[PDB]
């Protein structure tokens, strides 16, 4: 079936998490398709189903496990399986709909949520912005549990949204950005949870537009500047792929 990368929060270390993330990147882009030095995700179009998803199996010291499904085209979480049951974010269209049906085929219980997995929706449901939701090994530990128990009714909706926002940023966004990978490490190193500051959020929001500005740049020069924020919320602009070499690790396919 689809490839599985295993991770556990129990005795998680910086290397543990770093190895896991690199592992995940490796499984997303194996093609070495690269533009302006930044690897590019596979192109959605004419992608054989077999190559569309990858699974991330997560488990905690309490021995509760779930398996996320990530889309190799965007790196994003499309849903998860736990034990008997499996849940999916709302597909954006017919195509993405047919696709999910190849995930977790064996699962006895199949459900597709009415809502999508985009931040706007998830922050609405969580009752908090990403600014107010802490990240760390502990937060991730709880997120696993909260997904496991959902199948059984022991998880409230906001807690589920909240738990997704934690995984998306600790896995997908961390894959997409060495910078975000980094911020998570610091949190793990000290077993200290904290919500993401604007430098993080303005990145997460801008992945698409950065993926574009890059792939469409003139010899690396952005046709138009992409604006981001610093830790203190002060605005600054990015004119060149050069400054992002160390920042972003992946881009969705464009052109």
């Amino acid at each position, epitope marked *: 079936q689809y490839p599985i990368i295993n991770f556990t929060t129990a005795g998680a270390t910086v290397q543990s998490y770093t190895n896991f993330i690199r592992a995940v990147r490796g499984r997303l882009t194996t093609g070495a398709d690269v533009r302006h030095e930044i690897p590019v995700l596979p192109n959605r179009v004419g992608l054989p189903i077999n190559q569309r998803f990858i699974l991330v199996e997560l488990s*905690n*010291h*309490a*021995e*509760l496990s779930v398996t996320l499904a990530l889309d190799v085209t965007n790196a994003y979480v499309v849903g998860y399986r736990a034990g008997n049951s499996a849940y999916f974010f709302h597909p954006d269209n017919q195509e993405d709909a047919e696709a999910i049906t190849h995930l977790f085929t064996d699962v006895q219980n199949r459900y597709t949520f009415a809502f999508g997995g985009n931040y706007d929706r998830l922050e609405q449901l969580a009752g908090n912005l990403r600014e107010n939701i802490e990240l*760390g*090994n*502990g*937060p991730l*530990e*709880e997120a*696993i*549990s*909260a997904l*496991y*128990y959902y199948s059984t*009714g*022991g*998880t*409230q909706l906001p*807690t589920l949204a909240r738990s997704f926002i934690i995984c998306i940023q600790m896995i997908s966004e961390a894959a997409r950005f060495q910078y975000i990978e980094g911020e998570m490490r610091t949190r793990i190193r000290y*077993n*200290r*949870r904290s919500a993401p500051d604007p430098s993080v959020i303005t990145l997460e929001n801008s992945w698409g537009r950065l993926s574009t500005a890059i792939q469409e740049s003139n010899q690396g020069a952005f046709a138009s500047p992409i604006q981001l924020q610093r830790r203190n919320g002060s605005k600054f602009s990015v004119y060149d792929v050069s400054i992002l070499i160390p920042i972003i690790a992946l881009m969705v396919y464009r052109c």
Partner: nanobody
Amino acid sequence: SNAQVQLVESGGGLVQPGGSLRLSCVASEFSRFTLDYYAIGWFRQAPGKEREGLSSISSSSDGFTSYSDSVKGRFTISRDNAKNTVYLQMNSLKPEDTAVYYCAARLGGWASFSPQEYDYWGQGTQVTVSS
């Protein structure tokens, strides 16, 4: 029957306003997992009231804790692992706090004020603040 655990609360009673009580959640021997694997919450219920969440502690190894506005700077939830126990220390007690207090637990859980998010419950104990 993984995660099966019995919780016995105690430490409740009558106190003059401005007093202090220490409750206790003791997990009975022979649960497959010990209590440190658990989140424990603490709730109080008035006769008319439904269960209301007060203090909480996560299964998370960073010892993250939650406190409701009502009890902040007064209640402190803590752990003794070699005793397989979780204390809740109530200071500066006011008559408003009079109620039945419960401890609840969830294996690998998170700090929550929701009764639905815990699994195993204590038998409850009365707290009374008067003079």
